[PDB]
Amino acid sequence: ALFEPTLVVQALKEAVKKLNPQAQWRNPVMFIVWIGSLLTTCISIAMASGAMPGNALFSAAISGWLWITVLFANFAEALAEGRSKAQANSLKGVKKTAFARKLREPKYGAAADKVPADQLRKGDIVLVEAGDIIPCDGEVIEGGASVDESAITGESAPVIRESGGDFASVTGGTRILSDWLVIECSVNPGETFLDRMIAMVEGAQRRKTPNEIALTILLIALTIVFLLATATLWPFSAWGGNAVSVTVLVALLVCLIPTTIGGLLSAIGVAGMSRMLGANVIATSGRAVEAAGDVDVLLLDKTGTITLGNRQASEFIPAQGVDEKTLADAAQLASLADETPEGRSIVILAKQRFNLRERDVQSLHATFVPFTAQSRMSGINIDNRMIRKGSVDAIRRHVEANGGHFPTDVDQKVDQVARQGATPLVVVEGSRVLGVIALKDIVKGGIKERFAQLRKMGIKTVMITGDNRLTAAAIAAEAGVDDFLAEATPEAKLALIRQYQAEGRLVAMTGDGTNDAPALAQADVAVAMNSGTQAAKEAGNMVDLDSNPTKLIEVVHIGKQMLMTRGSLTTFSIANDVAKYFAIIPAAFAATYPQLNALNIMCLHSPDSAILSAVIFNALIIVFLIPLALKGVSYKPLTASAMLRRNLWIYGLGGLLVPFIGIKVIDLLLTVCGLV
Amino acid sequence: MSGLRPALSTFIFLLLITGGVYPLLTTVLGQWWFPWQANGSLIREGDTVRGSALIGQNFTGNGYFHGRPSATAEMPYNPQASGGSNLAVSNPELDKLIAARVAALRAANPDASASVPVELVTASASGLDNNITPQAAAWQIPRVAKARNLSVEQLTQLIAKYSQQPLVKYIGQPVVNIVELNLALDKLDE
Amino acid sequence: MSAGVITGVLLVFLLLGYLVYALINAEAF
Amino acid sequence: MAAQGFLLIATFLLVLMVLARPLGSGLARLINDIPLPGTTGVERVLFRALGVSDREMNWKQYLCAILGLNMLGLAVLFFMLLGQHYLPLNPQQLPGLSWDLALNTAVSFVTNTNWQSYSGETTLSYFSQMAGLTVQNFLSAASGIAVIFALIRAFTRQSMSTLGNAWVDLLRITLWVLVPVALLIALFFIQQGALQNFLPYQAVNTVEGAQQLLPMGPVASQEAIKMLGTNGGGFFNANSSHPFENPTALTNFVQMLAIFLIPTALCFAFGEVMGDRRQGRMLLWAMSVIFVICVGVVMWAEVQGNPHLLALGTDSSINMEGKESRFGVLVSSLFAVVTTAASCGAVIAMHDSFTALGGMVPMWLMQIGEVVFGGVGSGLYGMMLFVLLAVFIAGLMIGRTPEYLGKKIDVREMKLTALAILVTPTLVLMGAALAMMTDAGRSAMLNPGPHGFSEVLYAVSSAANNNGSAFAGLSANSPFWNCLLAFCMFVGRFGVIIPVMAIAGSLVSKKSQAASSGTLPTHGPLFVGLLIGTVLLVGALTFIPALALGPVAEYLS
Ligand SMILES: CCCCCCCCCCCCCCCCCC(=O)OC[C@H](COP(=O)([O-])OCC(O)COP(=O)([O-])OC[C@@H](COC(=O)CCCCCCCCCCCCCCCCC)OC(=O)CCCCCCCCCCCCCCCCC)OC(=O)CCCCCCCCCCCCCCCCC
Ligand SMILES: CCCCCCCCCCCCCCCCCC(=O)OC[C@H](COP(=O)([O-])OCC(O)COP(=O)([O-])OC[C@@H](COC(=O)CCCCCCCCCCCCCCCCC)OC(=O)CCCCCCCCCCCCCCCCC)OC(=O)CCCCCCCCCCCCCCCCC
Ligand code: VO4
Ligand SMILES: [K+]
Ligand SMILES: [K+]
Ligand SMILES: [K+]
Ligand SMILES: [K+]
Ligand SMILES: [K+]
Ligand SMILES: [K+]
Ligand SMILES: [K+]
Ligand SMILES: [K+]
Ligand SMILES: [K+]
């Protein structure tokens, strides 16, 4: 939902006010900042009243900027949680106050209840019409309709739900476009998919990840040494004749402790979970996402699918005398039964070229043939036409089986498509071929370049296909995978997982979830494809909504991006304190030891201006690093040492250098404004 | 009471070894191999000691080579109280003491150079310093020569006789043993 | 030594104790 | 001057490396549990006689063994110091020590700190100096090397639950490393002018007719293990400026080599036991770079010494105040940095008479954790804690869960690493704060201005970091000072030893994965610079305000 839009920024500035200590003591660094802010505000009120002599305006400005720092730290977490919950609120925008219709008999034509009751128990029978909303998750008893799964996929695409097979599984939040279905209720409200996604977006940082725990341990230790130095600085400076003012002490304490990473840690975690959920990968917690960054080998899965999912439809090619609209309609109608990402991408190309959208099921009287691994086909028999879609050799065997011969007009087209390298698919309708379609690569750099980058980063890639060795070698050569496994059994898969886990590696595997359940249980990071959500998310093995075998690449990249964002902002927060010392120490000891003005390498105006500039920079660096925490770090896939060198050059030297420039320009603004 | 017996056993064994075998063997080997070095480097004639060869004494006479200042307790060159004056650079007491030592050295050496050596005006780390550099010892040649009625070449060759140097010039400094030089000056009066 | 000094000392002691307790129990924080 | 200093540093590092390579191999053999050649059989019958036998025990029993031996030694030394006038070898008829002085001396000699608040030559008898202090000089060094042996064994072993026999480790270390090397060093010192007699104090007829009472006693036996174990507990009030302890530049060079012998050999042994010598070379390169930079800075600050000497009528401006004339200002600066970074209390120059800039870097090397060639393992595990912090930061910076030598690091190990990092600056800061809020702590002061606060900070850093080097102008013989310093040494030893052994017990039970292309290389110039940067940066962000109020203020003035 863009970056910082005013329709939600103000709505979460209403929610920044978590300033009560009951919601602040869970974060120790900002509870320290909150305690220091309260102390400085109380002593500034005392100074203004006349309890002790002092400026009573510089201290008030210091307290106000400390409160502004706490507000900015809460604002980062508020933006992260709002961006996490925005898509769930949009899902609940059509779910709340919706027309839910419930029947009285399981058959069609029965009396219907016009009451939107959300207390539907097991065995409850509901019916929906065209342009309606499903009440909850369930199984379709009978019927056939075009359902748009946009509410849970994030992109609009029609699917077919019908009785029989694996197509009798419809969820709640998605709308129904074309026809009527009757649905038996399968789960109680409370464990449904929409409630589980709501609990995902509101159950942020309930179970803290071990990386966040250890980083919190580091931040607590840094806060402890900084608090010890700042607190013991008062008896050290009392020997010089006059003591350091405690407002200066609290300001130096807040400027020293890592408030940047200390305020942006929860923002990093929630934004990383939002990036996970925006890629249509659903995990119970961030522990598996972080463990995906620790893996040394990736085990892919392309049984039941064509290619690795990186190739998707881009263009439609008529053969001869065939309308492109008719060819796209036939391909879309054949790819309704194809749940594989290529079969979905045919529908995306058809709707982006002609906007077919809604179809009709009962008037067609069509029987759907689901996609199978052994046939590599996805067809549909509408009345009598044998509409089928599959690979070129599969269609060649199909026309060798039937009486119609394969025409020789499309040999030039299939050779041309192979010449640009896209894999070709052929649609056949009874005995004729109306066109050959191309599946262009989606990755801009190339899937071979992506796998080479992952090999450079130290993660091996293993592609399991369950096919012949002639096809497997070609698929591995076109994809760029390091090694391939063919004719795979679950026992051999488990043996491969164990022998890769034995030699000091962590194995991440995608799979079906039901057909690959022991392998996914043995693997440390598990992703399920084409799996039932209610019977999958309770067991684990993180749900992939697109069923794309290459989603593990994005999961690994997002987890590593989270880890690198945390490390880079920790390095920035630690490195800022050198310039914080160079700004505050001559300002703090300007009267106790007046010879200490030689350490003022920056030509700052007054000690009050220097301390105020340091506090203003500490407040403003959090806002200046909100976009970096929300979007992650723009990391380049290289080796480990080269990545460490590049990140050190960007962030450690940056946090060494730019606080000097920031404090100097803030003091320049203060001098030209005349505040000091 | 479980591991108490091996703990007490190894503690008693290590205590008796490291406190009554290693020092006993070290003492026996030292007294066997290096007498006059394990016994204090004492200078003996007539069965009467006149000082160790390493310690150094407070020389205030006109005919003797003055050592570094000491600033020990209850006595200038007190071997019972080691440790020099722990006066920092910023301490004005150190500046007062150094100014007094410079004035006293310029009064004692009127025919020498006006720039006194640093070792003769700054107190050592321990007050029991028997060593000065050959430059600082050669700075005070004319006063000792006038007091002892000897010659500059004779004092220079005596200093070069009683000057010891390290194996390489950077692990230390060339030094002059003050005590045996002053007993040599006493022996040269006959 | 003084009332303000001893209140500052006890406040620093409570802050250090809270941070030490947060470091020991870091999963709950 | 600069060329002579560079030659001195280069030859010191060269002789140190070529001396500590075979001792590194021998210490690696001691870690790997293979007995030394020619020692087995005798070692077997000695272990059977002592009843230690074969007790392969875990980290809890190892830590209980170390703490039990340390408390037994503390009780024995405390009662010996209280009852030293009821014991033989007391020719001066010295009385028994007071309760505070005896407690402070016992804690400082058991916790490998070796703080001499008294004057030993007029405080201690020969039997006390030989049987409590030398025995604790052996025992604290053996305990530190045994703890770092346990840490190296924990990093090496795969999925075990035990850590080796602590008594076997202590007996092997003391019998085959600490005794014969110090015997050779002591006999070299007796070949030079050091003392190994037991005679009463010699009355001296001074040439002018004055009287001198030379303290003559078993000096070289205590001096050798003082230098070898990085103890720093001198026989006399002068720690190593006294000519009966350091009579020759050759003696001082052997002293410096003995000070750095055990840390360099322990790093070499670590690199040999884990099978990758580049891992030990990483630590050696980091310590060597920081050490060379600190020696050069202190050498320059001491060459450009007192600026008032030129105005007061001196030909040279070198800070020869509080420095022995047998040694150069360069040699005094080098020895200052060597013992001050190596957790050794020995001084050949008075550190209180140093320049402000030349005394800032010593107390900074103290306050960073005494990790630059520090201690007999006592700073090696501190460097290991800094390596754990550095691999945590670098693993997060590259995007992987952190691991050192293939062993993953988790919440418990990071908690204990953070606590072990936290223990000693906490002790420094609250000890100095308690010292500077009390007239009993501010009445021990000798130099006015910020140098007095520098003295207080140096003394509390000596107690907490187990160094024992003293800004000797402080009169730390008060009961309050003795109790505060004893508390600081006790916590700074046994609140760092305990979490290191807890990390060892948490790391024995982990598999070490094989290194891959994505595995972070923990050697090379990048990781050496990263370790140097994180040690320097942690020390700076902890201790810039104290140095600014002390030595920086004294420098500027
Ligand atoms: C004045 C220059 C300032 C810097 C001095 C640099 C000194 C060494 C330079 C070498 C670095 C470049 C080599 C690239 C190869 C890459 C492989 C690698 O990492 O190995 C490196 C290099 C080579 O080891 P290797 O042969 O690959 O090891 C395989 C062995 O099987 C395993 O056995 P091992 O590792 O235990 O022992 C190896 C040994 C086999 O054992 C023996 O045969 C016994 C000999 C003992 C070891 C040798 C003595 C080392 C003394 C070093 C210090 C002396 C001078 C220091 C100057 C201080 C003043 C600035 O083989 C050798 O003889 C080593 C050859 C190289 C040492 C040269 C001798 C000293 C001359 C100094 C000038 C050289 C300048 C070259 C370029 C400068 C680059 C910055 O290792 C070393 O550095 C020496 C090993 C022992 C010391 C451990 C490290 C301590 C740190 C060194 C001191 C640094 C001073 C502080 C820096 C100042 C900046 C502020
Ligand atoms: C603030 C952050 C901003 C900057 C950070 C990033 C800086 C990186 C500089 C990048 C520029 C060049 C890029 C191209 C690299 C190609 C060179 C190469 O082959 O790789 C070498 C190296 C990669 O190391 P590696 O891959 O881990 O090595 C594993 C090897 O398998 C095993 O390697 P090996 O052991 O076989 O070594 C062979 C060879 C490898 O190199 C070569 O092939 C030689 C030809 C290329 C020369 C480059 C390296 C040679 C020595 C470095 C000189 C350091 C001076 C500084 C200049 C920086 C630019 C080089 O090296 C030697 O010849 C020497 C052998 C002895 C090994 C140890 C020597 C220690 C070096 C002296 C101390 C290090 C710096 C101390 C200052 C501390 C900073 C506070 O890349 C570098 O150039 C790194 C230089 C390190 C200098 C600065 C490091 C600062 C790190 C951050 C400090 C702040 C901490 C933050 C904490 C905050 C949170 C608490
Ligand atoms: O693609 V599979 O890992 O189910 O053989
Ligand atoms: K820390
Ligand atoms: K900061
Ligand atoms: K020590
Ligand atoms: K000492
Ligand atoms: K520290
Ligand atoms: K430390
Ligand atoms: K320490
Ligand atoms: K220690
Ligand atoms: K710290």
Author numbering:
A (entry chain B): 7 to 682
B (entry chain C): 1 to 190
C (entry chain D): 1 to 29
D (entry chain A): 1 to 557
Provide the publication's sentences verbatim:
KdpFABC is a high-affinity prokaryotic K+ uptake system that forms a functional chimera between a channel-like subunit (KdpA) and a P-type ATPase (KdpB). The heterotetrametric KdpFABC complex comprises four subunits, namely the channel-like KdpA, a member of the superfamily of K+ transporters (SKT), the P-type ATPase KdpB, the lipid-like stabilizer KdpF, and KdpC, whose function is still unknown. This is achieved by a phosphorylation of the serine residue in the TGES162 motif in the A domain of the pump subunit KdpB (KdpBS162-P).
To further put this to test, we analyzed the conformations adopted by WT KdpFABS162-PC in the presence of the phosphate mimic orthovanadate, which has been shown to trap P-type ATPases in an E2P state and, of all E2 state inhibitors, best mimics the charge distribution of a bound phosphate. Interestingly, KdpFABS162-PC incubated with 2 mM orthovanadate prior to cryo-EM sample preparation did not conform to this behavior. Instead, the major fraction of this sample (~62% of the initial particle set) resulted in an E1P tight state, resolved at 3.3 Å, which is shows no large differences to the E1P tight state obtained under turnover conditions (RMSD of cytosolic domains 1.59 Å). (H) Superposition of the E1P tight structure obtained in the presence of orthovanadate (colored) with the E1P tight structure of KdpFABS162-PC obtained under turnover conditions (gray), showing that the adopted state is identical (root mean square deviation [RMSD] of the cytosolic domains 1.59 Å). The position of the orthovanadate coincides with that adopted by the phosphorylated KdpBD307, verifying the assignment of this state as a phosphorylated E1P intermediate. Only a minor fraction of the orthovanadate-stabilized sample (~11% of the initial particle set) adopted an E2P state. The minor fraction observed in an E2 state likely represents residual KdpFABC lacking KdpBS162 phosphorylation, as it is in good agreement with the residual ATPase activity level found in the sample. The fact that, in the presence of orthovanadate, KdpFABS162-PC adopts the E1P tight state instead of an E2P state strongly supports the idea that the inhibited complex cannot transition into an E2 state but instead adopts an off-cycle E1P state after ADP dissociation. In good agreement with this hypothesis, KdpFABS162-PC was stabilized in the E1P tight state even in the presence of the inhibitor orthovanadate, known to otherwise stabilize an E2P state. Notably, orthovanadate has the same charge distribution as the E1P tight state with phosphorylated KdpBD307.
